[PDB]
Amino acid sequence: SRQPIPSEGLQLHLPQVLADAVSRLVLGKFGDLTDNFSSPHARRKVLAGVVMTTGTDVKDAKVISVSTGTKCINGEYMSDRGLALNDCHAEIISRRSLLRFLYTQLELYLNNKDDQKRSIFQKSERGGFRLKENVQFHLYISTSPCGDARIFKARGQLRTKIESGEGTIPVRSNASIQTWDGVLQGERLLTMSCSDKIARWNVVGIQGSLLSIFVEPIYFSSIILGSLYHGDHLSRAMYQRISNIEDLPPLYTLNKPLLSGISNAEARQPGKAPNFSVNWTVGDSAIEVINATTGKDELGRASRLCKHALYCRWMRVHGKVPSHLLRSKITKPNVYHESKLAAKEYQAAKARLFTAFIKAGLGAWVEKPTEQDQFSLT
Numbered sequence: 001s002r003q004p005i006p007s008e009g010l011q012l013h014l015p016q017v018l019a020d021a022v023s024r025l026v027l028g029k030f031g032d033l034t035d036n037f038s039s040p041h042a043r044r045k046v047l048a049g050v051v052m053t054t055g056t057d058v059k060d061a062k063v064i065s066v067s068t069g070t071k072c073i074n075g076e077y078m079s080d081r082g083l084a085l086n087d088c089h090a091e092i093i094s095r096r097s098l099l100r101f102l103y104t105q106l107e108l109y110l111n112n113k114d115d116q117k118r119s120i121f122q123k124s125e126r127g128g129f130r131l132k133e134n135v136q137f138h139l140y141i142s143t144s145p146c147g148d149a150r151i152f153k154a155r156g157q158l159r160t161k162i163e164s165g166e167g168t169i170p171v172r173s174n175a176s177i178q179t180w181d182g183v184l185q186g187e188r189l190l191t192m193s194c195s196d197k198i199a200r201w202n203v204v205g206i207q208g209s210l211l212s213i214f215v216e217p218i219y220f221s222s223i224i225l226g227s228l229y230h231g232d233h234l235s236r237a238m239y240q241r242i243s244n245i246e247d248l249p250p251l252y253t254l255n256k257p258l259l260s261g262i263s264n265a266e267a268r269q270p271g272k273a274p275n276f277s278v279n280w281t282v283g284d285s286a287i288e289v290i291n292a293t294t295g296k297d298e299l300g301r302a303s304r305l306c307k308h309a310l311y312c313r314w315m316r317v318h319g320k321v322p323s324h325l326l327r328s329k330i331t332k333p334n335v336y337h338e339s340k341l342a343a344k345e346y347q348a349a350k351a352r353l354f355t356a357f358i359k360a361g362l363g364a365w366v367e368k369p370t371e372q373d374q375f376s377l378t
């Protein structure tokens with residue numbers, strides 16, 4: 001149960017070598033960012049990060065993102081303008097940080113011929129852009145992701161974080177529908193567990209809907225845990241529970257990344273979990289520190305990771321991409337929600353995912369109130 005589970009796809013690095021390297025690189029970068037772990041912000045329960053490799057040489061690995069955090073937003077603090085982070089579990093934050101890197105990389109491709117050489121993207125013959133060959137991303141988490149991977153209840157079942165609650169709880173037998181006004185009045189906000197979000201990324205990709213208008217689906221090649229690694233539980237949680245998925249749109253797949261623990265596993269530590277979450281993306285001068293309860297920084301400023309900020313980045317790319325090179329038509333992007341819906345193939349993939357969970361007996365995905373996404377840029 002402690003042996004690595006091979007990827008069912010490509011695998012270009014020795015598993016245990018890759019696992020130890022990515023875990024070392026993420027920890028090292030986090031130390032660098034926290035003044036050799038001396039910052040108040042070095043205090044963490046869970047550390048996560050993303051490492052990129054190019055080709056076969058593990059020496060070339062580059063840390064893309066580093067994050068911490070174990071909490072989510074208080075329901076009263078939901079933003080209807082995209083200004084608040086909903087979910088500050090480290091692994092979730094590390095993906096959003098990766099998104100910024102992806103926007104930057106598209107901008108390098110689009111800027112000019114010289115910046116273009118540095119980009120990890122190439123033109124796709126199918127339209128838009130795709131990764132250069134053998135560019136891979138690897139997810140590191142210092143412990144097993146919450147929900148199905150950690151809890152071992154029913155094997156593979158969907159589970160939610162619940163506001164101000166520890167751990168996760170099963171999804172109900174009848175599909176739960178959240179409402180803006182119900183949450184404001186005191187219904188506790190539910191957020192899908194990290195196990196469930198990563199399984200989601202193993203179908204719809206890590207890039208999200210908006211980025212899929214520009215690029216082909218991108219998947220993690222590896223998921224590396226720094227503690228509580230159990231191959232069989234993790235393989236079920238990360239993909240196998242939804243092997244029943246069908247009718248995926250073009251380029252989507254049920255991704256089955258390498259799964260591995262590390263040679264020197266961490267221990268469970270005592271202490272109250274920090275209420276904050278650190279994030280950093282390669283290229284950033286410093287970490288950003290977010291209060292998990294409000295989803296904003298300590299001064300009430302919006303995160304560089306918030307919906308609004310990501311949409312700002314997306315809009316900037318949208319103005320640079322010739323219409324005929326988009327993967328999905330979107331002439332005059334306005335409301336955030338509607339722009340996401342323009343990613344038609346991604347939405348179809350998401351629907352196949354939701355159906356897979358339901359049909360497998362694992363419950364129904366619990367979505368946010370729609371009002372979160374009903375905003376435009378000024």
Ligand SMILES: O=P(O)(O)O[C@H]1[C@H](OP(=O)(O)O)[C@@H](OP(=O)(O)O)[C@H](OP(=O)(O)O)[C@@H](OP(=O)(O)O)[C@H]1OP(=O)(O)O
Nearest residue numbers: 086087092096191192197207208209210307340366367368
């Ligand atoms: O990083 P996450 O916290 O997991 O955020 C995601 C993400 O939303 P944003 O990128 O707008 O913050 C998803 O968007 P996609 O790129 O996958 O489209 C969205 O899914 P929808 O597209 O269905 O809105 C999902 O929202 P939901 O909770 O309704 O599943 C939401 O997760 P959180 O709401 O938990 O932040």
Ligand SMILES: [Zn+2]
Nearest residue numbers: 089145146194
């Ligand atoms: Zn989690």
